[PDB]
Design an enzyme around this catalytic site. Structure first.
Site, PDB file in Angstrom:
ATOM      1  CG  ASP A 118      -2.034  -0.929   1.219  1.00  0.00           C
ATOM      2  OD1 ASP A 118      -2.175  -1.645   0.203  1.00  0.00           O
ATOM      3  OD2 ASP A 118      -2.803  -0.983   2.213  1.00  0.00           O
ATOM      4  CE  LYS A 174      -7.048  -0.930   0.076  1.00  0.00           C
ATOM      5  NZ  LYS A 174      -6.888  -2.400   0.008  1.00  0.00           N
ATOM      6  N   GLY A 181      -4.984  -2.746   9.265  1.00  0.00           N
ATOM      7  CA  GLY A 181      -4.527  -1.713  10.180  1.00  0.00           C
ATOM      8  C   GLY A 181      -4.262  -2.104  11.631  1.00  0.00           C
ATOM      9  N   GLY A 215      -3.052  -7.283   8.498  1.00  0.00           N
ATOM     10  CA  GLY A 215      -2.343  -7.566   9.736  1.00  0.00           C
ATOM     11  C   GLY A 215      -0.958  -8.186   9.582  1.00  0.00           C
ATOM     12  NE  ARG A 257      -3.156 -23.166  10.767  1.00  0.00           N
ATOM     13  CZ  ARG A 257      -2.192 -24.076  10.712  1.00  0.00           C
ATOM     14  NH1 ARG A 257      -2.303 -25.082   9.860  1.00  0.00           N
ATOM     15  NH2 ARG A 257      -1.130 -23.993  11.501  1.00  0.00           N
ATOM     16  N   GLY A 294       0.251  -3.397   4.425  1.00  0.00           N
ATOM     17  CA  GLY A 294      -0.380  -2.095   4.495  1.00  0.00           C
ATOM     18  C   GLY A 294       0.562  -0.965   4.845  1.00  0.00           C
ATOM     19  CB  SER A 295      -0.241   2.601   5.552  1.00  0.00           C
ATOM     20  OG  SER A 295      -0.842   2.855   4.286  1.00  0.00           O
TER      21      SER A 295
END
Ligand code: PLP
Ligand code: PLP
Ligand code: PLP
Ligand code: PLP
Ligand code: PLP
Ligand code: PLP
Lengths: 261, 261, 261, 261, 261, 261
Positions: A9, A66, A138, A200, A150, A221-222
């Site tokens: 990102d 997105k 996040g 995550g 899983r 992510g960021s």
């Protein structure tokens, strides 16, 4: 193609350059971190096309953007912009709580999130070219992504235990997908498209963990860019994703990473 | 007459001029943003006729005004004022929680909100000249409006699946409308009046989305005038509503829109 | 007599003069706005007779005063004071949660609130000379008053649909009133006493709305005197109540009313 | 080997030296007190290998490090680092809410927490070399640790009361462990591995209490180093753990300990 | 004896003098307003005997003091102090939630509160010389006291409707009192002891109201002394209690009373 | 030996001297008022043996100390310290929520709290030398202590009403005590050990009340030393406990006590 890669990102052209230099296989352009927006109660939408275009102009790796779930007009716009992939993302504020986009009516490939086998198959049935876990965006907590990969693996195995084709058909009906889709999965023991880890993934170890659980790649992510040393962290995540079952290499890239989250 | 148009909420004569210049097909005069009032717990009523008249005097496109649900005297007053349309609006504080206005006793046309087929038909039965979604006013989140237009369409289709005219009649009785009204809808596959999108339309993409979902036009709220560039945003929304199925046009008007909500 | 009139709440002699000049048919003397008191958790009682007498001395229209529900001693005192009407008011803190005052043992006439037909008939049975809706005092929201007048009308109509006199008698027993009272109401299609609108009447339109719904007059609260222009608002409410069926007149008095609530 | 010893949490090399001087049998390296992190909502992960290595370099007693439950890649990294033990710890944020690490595929020994007999046996079955109570980390309240050691002891005794081998096998199936594991425990009246006290051990008395309840050693947390006199407290806890059955010695080390928690 | 009188709460000798001058038939000595204490969460007990004695020394009318429910030692102490009456008061913090004091073992008379017939009879059975309503102390809201006097009167009447002595006996058993007690009440149509109004008596009108409902006297609280004119208010309450069915007198004492509560 | 005495909580040697001078039969050493600690959420443990020893060195009356429920090591330590009595106290943070200390394995006598007969008998069965009510520590509200002493007395009486020795045995089994213990209580009509009042004893009257209810002595808390005159209050409580059935003495010591709680 993106297989075995890291998608990062980025919220600026300079962040995109860092991603590219670090070895990212692609970049995910967004004007705003939806995680922060989300905790603000704000509505998060498709990013301004001019911002996406400024990122496309700054790197030569593929760019993703997105759109809101169900927002097929945002998708038409992004497609006209000629991004390489569209992420129909639960991280943005959903536009349609009932219907996802009819992705097979577009030429640009879509990635969609899934928490379980049913979701993954419906998304594929709608035309998704790629699946990713939904994880927990996040939070820097890898456990939701782990749970989804899983669960899909487990459900596939459980369905392979059914020895009756009628039972299979009943499962497909419950999932709201063509029985032939479900049957293909059960024979191949895997989804007909790549499944990436997303949500995550905070550390190189997290990235390698998801690869060892059977993901084909990872989205980060960021958080990367909030760390005290973004280039080092980005490079470490790419290396871990590449050498995901090489413990000494994983040890080497995880060492002295500095302050994260 | 307004079909294919954008109706814009305005709180001053100067805002109305901007709306007109931007290509709005009509303006909705209100002295106060009910969204803000609502979050204040305040009672929101019909606007002062003097403020409405000052808006009527400032533009040559039609002017609408809101009255409280069931408040037939507010409507008589607005009608005497000679506004072009009356919106019996759930955004204002309802005056009657049981009965809507007997709109067929007025000469001025009314627009009413509806969340589903039953509501739309009761409002048409009472005399509404125009239906709009209820959406979620002041939130900038298009999903409620999307949900309503989808629901009406779905219920129409589901009713078309009934083959028992007795079943149809039972549905009409449950909806509290004449069976002939319901039957006309089922034959034509659509409401006998125009259905506009309203509530939570924040972007040009949102406006086009609702048109592609089959709306006949769109209402936009005061968010337009809170943006960093109202004229540009207003113009972009009108263009998107007009060219709602032209992706490159949609791309062009969505680019560099500036700060919204 | 008070029929077709506006009764205004006043807390000083000067407010009473304004009411009188505006054309109020009567004034309701109170030392304190129970709405404010109520939101303070304070106990609200009969006003000091000296304050009521100072109001009686300042105008030549009839004066009313409130007493707590069930407080027959407050009423004996107000009666000895020679006010023209006593309002046994749910806006004050009730003194008796079981029994209302035995109003037919007094010479001064009482007004009582009612939310439905049963309540109205019990109050009349106890001796009330006048009924008023209970509305929602101090809120400026007319919908509770509307709800009560609608409910009484609806219940009367529903009872008129019964054709067993036994069924009627069973209804009267449930309501705890003499069957002859209920039967009189069913024959004449209306209460044997005037029914006024009260609680939440904030605008001229609200006043006219309640008259068109069949009220015989309106009570307005202290909101009149909190407006930016009390004399104008008071006059407009009187005019609307008088000309409740004249839309152009209603338009004229509603225009440029200034800041309310 | 560690039997009869105290393992101390340390967050710096200097804290590790104090632990060693005090007579700790081992140290638990962590970069952050998960108790504090936990109350911050932060995600707590494996510590940076560089910080762990700096601790390993500062003492000659064994070093332990924690990994998140289910995070076998963190464990592969810590193993490559050559720590002496890995604590798969519920105090860190779990990575896998379904599966613990397959510990028997590693060469480094693991310690795992357990609240009851079923948990202890599943962890041992997965390959844990050592069990510890889960207590309540960072609270300084010993009662959760006491509860767990009591529960395991009680369940063992209750199972010893069964005399159907079928009943035993049913218990093992419910626990999801091989019946031979359960049977071994029932014959010897104890777990096949050492069971240490952990979580909420705040005082020398607490340490001795858990030893008298049958623990084989104790883990103590960062509370030691928040006390007004860390060296004295650390030494007292080691002495109490060694002489856990000697009341006059316990009295002597408990006296004048200064300010704790 | 106290019949037809007003008992006033006083917290100082000077307040007691005002009470006496105003015409109070007795004074209730207390060091602290339990209403304020209660809202503070504080425990309210028997007042310091030296304070009670300073009040006894300042007036020649009888003095009462409160003890906690069930606190027979506080009562023994107050009795040794030679107060004229003991109020076993629910306004203080109860000492025994199961048993009231065995009042018939004392020589000093007790007053007790009661909310209904059962309570009144149990209190009398235990030895209470006088009953009072419980009302709602410190609120200035008379409605609880009204409710209790109404309820006792109603239950007495309802019991008089039972024509079987077995039914009566069953009621007595449910009330936990001797059937002869209940039967005496049913024949006489009243309690065998005086019943005073207490709790929430704020105005002269309130006092007269309770007298007209059949009370034999009234207790007033510290509200008297928080009014802007204590002597005037105290005198007005005494006059109203004396001339409780003389409306012109009640009007005269209620006029210009100044600021209350 | 302590029968008829007052045990006072003290937090310093000087407080202990005051207790001794006042006539306390013993002192309860604690470093911290658990009431305050409790309201802080803090964990309250055995006090530092050094602080207890400093109190032991300052007076010649017996000294007690508290340990956490189930904390047999804290008890071993306090026993080695040679305090005269150990209070296994619910006021401290419980160390074992299932098992109390096996008090009959110690030589020092224990006092335990009990809320009812079952609890008292289990504590005696475990080896308690003395029982006390649990009351409500730190509240100054005597009603919980009263409730417990009343409950034990009532349950004893109720059990004496059983004529079936089988019924008795069933009660003992439900209580989890030997039937011979329960039978001894039923014959003697009392517990086989002294029962002291504790928790919420704030005034001399409170102390005498509990003695008259059949307690053998009283514990008072740190409230004594928060009063404006500790020596006077302490002395008054001792006198009241000694002369608990002499009203004029109770009157004398209760007078002019100053500010409490
Ligand atoms: C986050 C998220 N996941 C999944 C869905 C829908 O998935 P499915 O239709 O397969 O249940 C939606 C919309 O409801 C969504 O917003
Ligand atoms: C927001 C809103 N929708 C709908 C209604 C009523 O719709 P219907 O009569 O069809 O139930 C009301 C008020 O009555 C309303 O406030
Ligand atoms: C406001 C109000 N309305 C009505 C009632 C009594 O009306 P009714 O007894 O007829 O129900 C009371 C209730 O105690 C009341 O306080
Ligand atoms: C702290 C903790 N203990 C135990 C478990 C797993 O233990 P078990 O699977 O044996 O129940 C997990 C639950 O997901 C856990 O996180
Ligand atoms: C305020 C109050 N009223 C009444 C009672 C007891 O009254 P009765 O025992 O008759 O129910 C108590 C004690 O429980 C009380 O505190
Ligand atoms: C306040 C308190 N009372 C009583 C108990 C236990 O009493 P019993 O074992 O009789 O239930 C506990 C703890 O176990 C406790 O904390």
């Amino acid at each position: 193609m993106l297989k075995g890669g890291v998608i990062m990102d980025v919220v600026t052209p300079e962040q995109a350059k860092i991603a590219e230099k670090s070895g990212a296989c692609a970049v995910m352009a967004l004007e705003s971190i939806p995680a922060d927006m989300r905790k603000s109660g704000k509505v998060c939408r498709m990013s301004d096309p001019k911002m996406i275009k400024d990122i496309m102009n700054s790197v030569s790796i593929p760019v993703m953007a997105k759109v809101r779930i169900g927002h097929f007009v945002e998708a038409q716009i992004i497609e006209a912009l000629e991004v390489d992939y569209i992420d129909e993302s639960e991280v943005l504020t959903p536009a349609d709580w009932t219907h996802h986009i009819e992705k097979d009516k577009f030429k640009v490939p879509f990635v969609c999130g899934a928490k379980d086998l049913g979701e993954a198959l419906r998304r594929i049935n709608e035309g998704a070219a790629m699946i990713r876990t939904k994880g927990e965006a996040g939070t820097g907590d890898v456990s939701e992504a782990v749970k989804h990969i899983r669960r899909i693996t487990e459900e596939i195995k459980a369905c392979q235990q059914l020895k009756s084709e009628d039972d299979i058909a009943k499962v497909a009906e419950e999932m709201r997908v063509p029985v032939s889709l479900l049957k293909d999965v059960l024979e191949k023991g895997k989804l007909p498209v790549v499944n990436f880890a997303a949500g995550g993934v905070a550390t190189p170890a997290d990235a390698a963990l998801l690869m060892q659980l059977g993901c084909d790649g990872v989205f980060v992510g960021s958080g990367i860019f909030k760390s005290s040393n973004p280039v080092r962290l980005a490079t470490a995540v790419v290396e871990a994703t590449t050498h995901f079952d090489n413990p000494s290499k994983l040890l080497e890239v995880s060492s002295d990473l500095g302050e994260l989250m």
